[PDB]
Amino acid sequence: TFDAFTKVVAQADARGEFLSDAQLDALSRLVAEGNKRIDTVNRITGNASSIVANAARALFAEQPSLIAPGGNAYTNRRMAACLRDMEIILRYVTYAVFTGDASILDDRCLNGLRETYLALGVPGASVAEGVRKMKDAAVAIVSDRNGITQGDCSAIISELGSYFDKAAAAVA
Amino acid sequence: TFDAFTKVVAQADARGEFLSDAQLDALSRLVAEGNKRIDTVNRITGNASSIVANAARALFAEQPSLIAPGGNAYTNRRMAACLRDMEIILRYVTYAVFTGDASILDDRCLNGLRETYLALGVPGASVAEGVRKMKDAAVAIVSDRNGITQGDCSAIISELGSYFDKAAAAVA
Amino acid sequence: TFDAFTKVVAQADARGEFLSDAQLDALSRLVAEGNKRIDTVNRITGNASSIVANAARALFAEQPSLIAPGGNAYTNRRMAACLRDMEIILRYVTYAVFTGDASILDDRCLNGLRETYLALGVPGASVAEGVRKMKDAAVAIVSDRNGITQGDCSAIISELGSYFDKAAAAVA
Amino acid sequence: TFDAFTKVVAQADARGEFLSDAQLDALSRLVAEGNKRIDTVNRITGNASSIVANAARALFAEQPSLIAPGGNAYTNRRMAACLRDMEIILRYVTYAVFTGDASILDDRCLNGLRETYLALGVPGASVAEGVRKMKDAAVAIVSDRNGITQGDCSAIISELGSYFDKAAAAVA
Amino acid sequence: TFDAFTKVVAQADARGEFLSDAQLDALSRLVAEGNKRIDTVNRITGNASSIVANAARALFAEQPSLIAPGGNAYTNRRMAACLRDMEIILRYVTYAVFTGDASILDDRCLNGLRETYLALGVPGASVAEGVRKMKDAAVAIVSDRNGITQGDCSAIISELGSYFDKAAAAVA
Amino acid sequence: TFDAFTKVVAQADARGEFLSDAQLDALSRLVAEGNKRIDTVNRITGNASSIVANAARALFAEQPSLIAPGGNAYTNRRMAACLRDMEIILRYVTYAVFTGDASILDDRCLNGLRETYLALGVPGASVAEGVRKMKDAAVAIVSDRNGITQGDCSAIISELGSYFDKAAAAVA
Amino acid sequence: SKTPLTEAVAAADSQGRFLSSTELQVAFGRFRQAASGLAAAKALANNADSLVNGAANAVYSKFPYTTSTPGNNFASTPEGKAKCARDIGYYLRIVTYALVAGGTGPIDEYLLAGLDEINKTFDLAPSWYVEALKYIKANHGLSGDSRDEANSYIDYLINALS
Amino acid sequence: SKTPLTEAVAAADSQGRFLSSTELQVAFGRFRQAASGLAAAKALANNADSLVNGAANAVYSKFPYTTSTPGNNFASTPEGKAKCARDIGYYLRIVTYALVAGGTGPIDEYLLAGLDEINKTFDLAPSWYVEALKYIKANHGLSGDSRDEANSYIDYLINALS
Amino acid sequence: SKTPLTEAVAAADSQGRFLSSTELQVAFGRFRQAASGLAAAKALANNADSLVNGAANAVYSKFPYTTSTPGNNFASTPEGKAKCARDIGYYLRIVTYALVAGGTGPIDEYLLAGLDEINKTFDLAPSWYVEALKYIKANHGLSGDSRDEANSYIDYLINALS
Amino acid sequence: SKTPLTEAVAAADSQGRFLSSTELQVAFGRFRQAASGLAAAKALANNADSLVNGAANAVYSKFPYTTSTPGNNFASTPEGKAKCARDIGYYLRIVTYALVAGGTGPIDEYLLAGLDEINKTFDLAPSWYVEALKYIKANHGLSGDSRDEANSYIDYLINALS
Amino acid sequence: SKTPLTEAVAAADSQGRFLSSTELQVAFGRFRQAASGLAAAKALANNADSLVNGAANAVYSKFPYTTSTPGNNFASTPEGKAKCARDIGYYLRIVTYALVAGGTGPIDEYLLAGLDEINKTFDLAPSWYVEALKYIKANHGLSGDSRDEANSYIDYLINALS
Amino acid sequence: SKTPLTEAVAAADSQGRFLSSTELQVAFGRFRQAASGLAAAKALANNADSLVNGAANAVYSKFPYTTSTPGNNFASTPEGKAKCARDIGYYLRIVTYALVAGGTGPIDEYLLAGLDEINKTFDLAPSWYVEALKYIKANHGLSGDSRDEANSYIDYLINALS
Numbered sequence A, B, C, D, E, F: 001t002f003d004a005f006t007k008v009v010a011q012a013d014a015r016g017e018f019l020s021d022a023q024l025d026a027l028s029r030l031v032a033e034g035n036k037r038i039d040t041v042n043r044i045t046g047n048a049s050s051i052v053a054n055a056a057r058a059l060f061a062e063q064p065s066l067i068a069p070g071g072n073a074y075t076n077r078r079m080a081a082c083l084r085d086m087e088i089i090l091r092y093v094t095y096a097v098f099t100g101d102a103s104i105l106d107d108r109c110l111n112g113l114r115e116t117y118l119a120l121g122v123p124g125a126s127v128a129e130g131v132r133k134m135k136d137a138a139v140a141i142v143s144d145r146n147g148i149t150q151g152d153c154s155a156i157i158s159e160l161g162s163y164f165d166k167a168a169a170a171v172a
Numbered sequence G, H, I, J, K, L: 001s002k003t004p005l006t007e008a009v010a011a012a013d014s015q016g017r018f019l020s021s022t023e024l025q026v027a028f029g030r031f032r033q034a035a036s037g038l039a040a041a042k043a044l045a046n047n048a049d050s051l052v053n054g055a056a057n058a059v060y061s062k063f064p065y066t067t068s069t070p071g072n073n074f075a076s077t078p079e080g081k082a083k084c085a086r087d088i089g090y091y092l093r094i095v096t097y098a099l100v101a102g103g104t105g106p107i108d109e110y111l112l113a114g115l116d117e118i119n120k121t122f123d124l125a126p127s128w129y130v131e132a133l134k135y136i137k138a139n140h141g142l143s144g145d146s147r148d149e150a151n152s153y154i155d156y157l158i159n160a161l162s
């Protein structure tokens, strides 16, 4: 996988050149925004259990057929597995925010999930709705101003949002 | 794998229903025929080697090209593998009769066979004939009237024949 | 895998026949010149490092794109990897000359190599020329009349080449 | 491991001898009392969790140093472990009653356990008291006249007790 | 293993108590001298290879028996083994300074080492001498005033000293 | 392990000396007698099964208690284990003769054998008699002057017996 | 899943052996009890509606707060109570499968597996279900071997919820 | 060794599980069988003499070359027939052990393990033992359950020796 | 257990290498945080009585049935209250340890491992601890880096209980 | 299959190394043998009908019950005679192959692997073949290295047969 | 690709856990460094011509034989010097990447892995590169944290080359 | 100690097999060469003074700086020259062991294992030894088989040094 830093290094080494100032200044920006980045990771993690359960409750409420006898979430074993998947994706998204690159999420989580689901009969489109649920919840948690030093977090929130988007589209 | 019992159960919970009073009257019938089933398992088992041996002999006498130098069964290592294949099918077939469901026979033996023989170059059609000679032998061993309390056993014989036919058709 | 001897035995066994006099005269000729087969092997191995070093240097000199940044052999780790490949092909080729068979070369080295290289993005056609450069270097070293009892080693020289050629065609 | 049957067989084979009529009837007596043995296993198993739970509570209420900070069952993880050891000992004891022989308990559970505790720093003596607590509770359960066709289950009850004693003995 | 922090935490938990102010304000002083701890680790590490090579030399120059044929550091396989050992001890000693607790060096490195050298025949006293040379060489490296901001860093030098001493005493 | 040649070499390096002229000539004489050593290996090997079988019969004949029920040899499983031990020893013995050194025998066979027998309760003194009998049958087969070129292989015969004597002593 | 028949065959398979007199004795024990297992399954099924509603109420009385405190995981709303009743219906029905199979298999498949995560994630109290189970056991009306087998499955679950 | 009771516990132990209704069913299956299994062991034993000598002779008659040809593996000497009579006794004694244990375990333990390698190294024809077993099966005179299980073991050995 | 210092050496040791710039940074991060953590621990330690008893009352307040329902798992007796007061204090104390170590390490080691097993076995509702924890967080009175770190260990525990 | 050459290359390959003085000596040893091996292989081949028929009669002569006793496994019919003749011929041909390869490879692959399984199922006595092999050894009339080479394989099969 | 950021997630992932206070302190340490790290990267890159050309001369001056001795692996030809300069440039470039990443990762991945191999095959003396590295180190002009991190890498390579 | 005899047995042992014709051929190859290999060892040993001293001088000649440049790794002092002489002798002696053994065993064990690590740690140039080894090959005075076997070990070392 890559860092926001190793990502740039790679692109540069492919050309045998040092980093261009436009590349050095792009990273100095991510460094200065650092605290906001660290706050985003902690806020989602501190609420992970609620982000998952609530996002799951909504899903089943709008798609009852999932929990009707006949599954695919109907057994207790698969209901557990489904909850697990939601936790897994959310965990991998925080990894992306923490490193500042999607490689971690794409390379170890999303890659091959659309097909792994297809081969099992799990409704990938449903998983996409669950991921979107968590995105909104997570975004709102990150946007909350109560109990933090005020500032403009818009960049970090849009980046965060795109990772969730990648998770959705990867199984849509 | 499924038992005749758990097979019905799987059908019921997918539907989220108790077994129908009807479904229970069927299983009870298999239960009341329990002795006959135990006997057919015991009978074939006590004659495994000769079942294998005789079917093997007859098959080769009818298809000598399998025994000649360069035939599939020609060497000792492959003759052994050939006899082995024969007792495998027989053994799994007994497993099927004992549990009253073919799932053990399908998941653990047959499934994949046809393709395995293809890549290796084993005459599947010839295996099929061998298995059929085993069936004929087994059925007569099972229906012999001597030394056993008498009654109608026709139902377990055909249920036993179906397991042999499944194996037979899985190879060609 | 087979050696010149078991190869013939194989062709004879599938026919269920004793080796013909033509098969025996052929093998007994190979035995008679075994001394040349011994030297050829010792001469290649005796110059193993330089044959690979010099061929690799000429290979990069001819295709500098391979070592410039962004090239397949560009990094250090991959440079070591590419050299290893050069060493492994040579080792198996000597294996083939030693057994008097190519099966060790084909089964245990070349089979599936083209597929691996394509999957990794390793310029297979570039590997083929590196192999051809080793061939010429090895051929010349083996044909060298100095320090060895004089004679014509051309039958073995021709066999050595066929193995190098199989390697080149297999990676392309 | 042995059965109540196979334990007798081992004794007779060693001596090269058929089982005497005496040893044979001694076993038919055990067989005629199978139901009781079966009920004993079912009863303990039906109350397994409460057997363990209450004994742990009683043990701690009697030896508070156990759970005060710095004691062997303090912290969560030790405690869980301690609770598991109790369930394990009780599980294996039920295996002894079922097989009608102690070897399954001594072999797979008790042998080496004493040394296990010492290396760890676990107080065997108190682990021993815990076992005695489960015994009294299990014996009281097995000996309850409520809800069972009446009879004398005292041979099996002293039999149960012998295994609990073996467990307490192996621990200290 | 523990770090300076968890060590104190373990002693406090054993007594079901919060840290005192003596424990707290003591950990505060360590935190305050953290930059020095970090510089010492970096300095030893930055001269790892030369510290080992130079001490090894001095060792062999004063104790040539080790290097005479049939000596212990004699072959090339052992001599490499001996150098590695020197690097290992130094490596683990840097881990002790980094964590602020010796448990890492004792638990994973020094534990049972004397036993190990006894069964093999490795002159443990010479190993101890090699370590002492690494001590003196390392201390001088960390006490060097050039190239860093000046201050009294004799506290962590004493701590480093105790780790090196533990190492030497564990082999002697 | 060691070769007769690597045995002398190992000793030489420890002293850091070239082999003395006596050592080299001593090895030259072994090489010159190599044909006899080869025949010794082949004979015994062509006669292993009978050498083992006839040795066991003789042993049990003289010691019926080994076979009587309760005897160490009494079961089939263990009679099979006993036959195996005899083959193993004879086999490692031929290894000793083929390499001109006893290391293979003491290292992967005799080493700790006496002890595994005391733990299992296998009568070492009986095994020793067994090996003892395999020594004479072997000696007489190797000594047979028929179907071979005439010469005196007394040196090789004495060495062979020595390996046998060692195995018998490494137990009894 | 686990039953006398699958366990017997699986054990023979892992050993690469043909069935023998031991597995035959296993088969006799299963039929000697299938009759009363099925009968127990038929009776429970036929009395299901009163057993579930009766078990449901018993829990609402033992735990009044589950019906008078707003919470997604409580039954203080019409939908909540339906979820609880549905649940109690799952336990009962799954117990009838264990009786049909003659083993814990269907239970360990459809319910047990992941049962701990589910209760924790949804804040459902295991004691609620232990209570629903006891009411079911005290309202069986079952007798003989039919009672014992049914109870061994209920106590098995009660054990799993503690 | 393998018996209905040892297996049930071996399975539960490797699974780390308490016994449940399945193992109990297995216990009932065993105790249903034990009766006829013990009476069979008692009957075969009371008639050991007649059966061994009887079987031994059926082998010598179907294979006369074993009593007339010289060799360590044959019975052309008083000592030869002794080993043979002794062996048959072993086969029969071990069979009454399987009946006692209600499983092949004792056959597996004291006989079957290492049998082929014993017959090969000592050049004993497996067909000779097959013949002796056929005689025992045809002459023990047992009926019902005792016959069925006893023959289960005789045929197990026959299958093993072929 | 688990802290920035122990993980760094662990990763390095597993990879068989010397520490480098990456682990030094870890150490710089650890020391930037340490002062805050220790003062958080010092603060929580001094406010122990108030916090523990204030949290206990918050729990009994949210769930009145825990003080009025007969049972060994409840705080309906003075014996149960002392057990409940003790447990909460365990959490608070264990949390101050996390602050001293700068990681969940002491929480993992002394509390979290085995927690679920313990809560189920003794029938202790996890939500009960999820409230006391909310009380501690809403009343600790910590700000800045001390607030942020303390809350992560508290939210870490709340998440582990749901 | 096993031969000096394939074994050499296989060992070097396992250790991922180039051939050395050792493997070259193996080749010299091979080439020292191989002419003797091909000549013996050629000589036995040219004397096949005499060796096979002779060996067969040595068998029928030593075991007369094999030509007088009815059975799928006996040579009492002309077809049974055909099989025995063919089998003896199989051993003879596969032996010539080992002489060509200079190793037991072709014996291992074509005839030894599974040999015991075949003798058991089809009730063929290893002694019949041991006798056939002995006759062949006493009658091939081989000399020198050709004889010693050939006899190593005949004795290898004999040992494998007992 | 070893850095604080990738190691924190790798360890977190291998343990199947969400990030926590520990990895946060990791990030703080990373950001407390990145600025000086990136600055040192820009500075070194800005004076690459002097550093590199100034380094090659140090080597030739110290090891004059490299410029007078003929051979493929020496700098006594125009192309020999060209490659020696590129080689030094590679070292510097990759060190800047190490500074941009705040870890040895780019060094490990692009240079170190396979270095000894390359130096031995192409007969390049490790002490040549040590001299170059020492020249770069002494002609930094870098101060503080930029000087310290940049020197840990320069010394990291020197250690690897000795 | 990789040698024809030990390797053969190691292989047969790893397969649980007795030695056969293939291993026998290996022995023949071994003894058909040990005669010249042994005589070669004697000769190299008796010419040790001129070979070692001549090689050391050939090294100092092709690498003038090794006797001028001060440094622990160089021979600019008598101490350095003595060590170098010493070093050269080790190679020669270990090569005679290879001849006595008929394989690379002695080389691999006492010299080659850990070689690269040693030349690196003490900054010794592999080219130096490569050249000393060329001088040895030039000056053996060996011919035929003795020459060819010696040269294979000298080239085996040359390879390992490149």
Ligand SMILES: *C(C)[C@H]1/C(=C/c2[nH]c(/C=C3N=C(/C=C4\NC(=O)C(CC)=C4C)C(C)=C\3CCC(=O)O)c(CCC(=O)O)c2C)NC(=O)[C@@H]1C
Binding pocket: D032, D033, D034, D035, D036, D038, D039, D040, D042, D142, D143, D144, D145, D148, D149, D150, D151, D152, D153, G033, G144, G145, G146, G148, G149, G152, H021, H024, H025
């Ligand atoms: C000893 C602990 C106490 C006791 C035991 C006792 N039990 C029985 C008889 C039976 N027990 C069963 C048990 C089961 N049947 C089942 O289907 C299941 C579930 C799989 C179980 C656990 C059965 C079938 C019987 C026999 C039929 C019957 O109801 O009698 C007896 C009687 C005798 C006999 O040997 O059969 C006794 C004495 N009785 C006590 O008073 C002790 C406290």
